Design a protein around this ligand. Sequence first.
Ligand SMILES: [Cl-]
Ligand SMILES: [Cl-]
Lengths: 362, 362
Amino acid sequence: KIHHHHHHMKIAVLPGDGIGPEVVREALKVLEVVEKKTGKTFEKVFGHIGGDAIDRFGEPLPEETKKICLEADAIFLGSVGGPKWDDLPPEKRPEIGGLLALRKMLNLYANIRPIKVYRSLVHVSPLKEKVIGSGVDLVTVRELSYGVYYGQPRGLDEEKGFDTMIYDRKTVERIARTAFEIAKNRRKKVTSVDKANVLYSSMLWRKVVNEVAREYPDVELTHIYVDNAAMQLILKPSQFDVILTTNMFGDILSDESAALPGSLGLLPSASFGDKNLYEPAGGSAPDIAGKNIANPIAQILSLAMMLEHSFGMVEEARKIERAVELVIEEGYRTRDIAEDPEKAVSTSQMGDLICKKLEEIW
Amino acid sequence: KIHHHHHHMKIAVLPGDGIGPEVVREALKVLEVVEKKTGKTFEKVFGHIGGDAIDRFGEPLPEETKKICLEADAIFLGSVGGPKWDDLPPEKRPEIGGLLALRKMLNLYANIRPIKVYRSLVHVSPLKEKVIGSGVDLVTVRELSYGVYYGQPRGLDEEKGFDTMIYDRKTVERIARTAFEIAKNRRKKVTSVDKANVLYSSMLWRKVVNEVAREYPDVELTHIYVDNAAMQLILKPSQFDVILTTNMFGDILSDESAALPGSLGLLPSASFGDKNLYEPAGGSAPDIAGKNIANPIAQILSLAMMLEHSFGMVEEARKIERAVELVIEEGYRTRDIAEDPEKAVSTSQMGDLICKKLEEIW
Ligand SMILES: [Cl-]
Ligand SMILES: [Cl-]
């Protein structure tokens, strides 16, 4: 879609449980800098989800929260879940009854997971410095609406279980275009990952991606098998810009690529849907909840994704990205990325450093 | 099965094309040491497959070769394919009409792919030395007969393609027992990899593996999601002994784990079937075919797997494994694992070093 200049935006903020609130607080301090500099109004409507909603309403995704989510332009979500609520069944716990239920209600079709290895944290990566090479800067664009997680028929009886892996043209068109557009505004390269040598779903996938790629003549398209992509993420990850793939392969590969920066606290996530959903790629951290330890960068970079993809504020998002990088490049580390742990800054300190830097470079 | 002492064994040797013959030659020189030391007769029946068979018979898997394969106790296969035969259609090329056709005819149910990072080649691995930790020594046991590659219905039309991912009890029992038995004779740990939180096939998988695991009370069983296994292969691979998984997940994960030693020339493969099939994990190397460069270790360690799994000659196989390790530990390198390429030994030199060492330590 075309993003026109808008000066009033509405965000549903659902801070969650445990570290959620701590890191969402910092993200919102960065949003305050953006607000000051751009003169735009971000109307924030706060909503209760997960443990917070169970306590207040008796259920993890109450009607009130759903209404807030459906009335906002974008949804900004912290983390949900904690030991207080474990021991509730399945359907009633935060992570299932709250988070998975929200995701389902949004009819999401794409998950976008950017992965950067910062030059200054290469020593934190599991990969040797020469393997990282000229650098890692990629994005997985994963199909979320169909494929094997939703294909019918599916079922389980006493002797067998089955699922159907299926793609159709309209589904693949939608996600392919998403990936091509992201590629257009990045390094103009898409790699599509499938298993077209063995699976019919993947033969259809590849056929339709090749069709869409004609609408984007300036974007380089390569195709690789998922097993070979799994090896290439480790042997030469710098070859990738946008990685376009299926529900299942994207699930496996985006988690593999998450090992590369070597901390989940660094990694943002966006899902595109009826409304877009912005959240850290990693989950609950019950053992540090409340201690001002958690790394806020994932939540902050999720804010940057929201600005870019919900609001078309691409320049602003790139400035947030730059301020994070500059603070890291300066040597500042939360515990999750510190070699010397007693030299770690807190959640709140890290958040203030990023805000002061963003004001500096703006 | 129980391996009784046998003194006469029959092997179908299908050397293949390109580097196949070079490396199979060395493996067979190691087999000559084993023959001398054990006093056993290995009757080798040589067979033509791939390019070699096209040239001689007009097709890549002729009736003569099939007969040799079905009359032998085990099948030892080099590499097939080369530029001479590319440009034949699909069904008539070496890799499809020869290799995939052989595999299909054998009704294989398990692929076994051992992965070791030798202490002395850690610098060749893509992973940092501290990531490797206490060491990498694992084996993937992959189901080959069913799951999404074979489940019905399946198909492709103009607007959609689909496959069915399915497991039943009898299929999972068979592969689980295979993995448990391998674990029994190794470090008594199995990790089973599935997607039981989302897929019915995986719920059945997990249920039946848990059942089989009762027949093996001294083997530690863990279960992990495939996306988390994909991350753990990079972040902490030393936690794994036997990895038991499905057709598709094993395909992706065994290829990922192949990036860890950082050369395919090191990696053997066994498939269990009507007869067992022993081959290098990697393929064609047309650019070095005939130059006495190829690393023979994969073919040599495939011979060790054959001795162990077809013939129950476990001690002999561990001696071959030991002689390879000792030659590496000494500093000898073929080009694929040499930092200084002009200091590389040839295929034939590497093969002689291993034979002389095997004679030394026997
Ligand atoms: Cl899928
Ligand atoms: Cl499967």
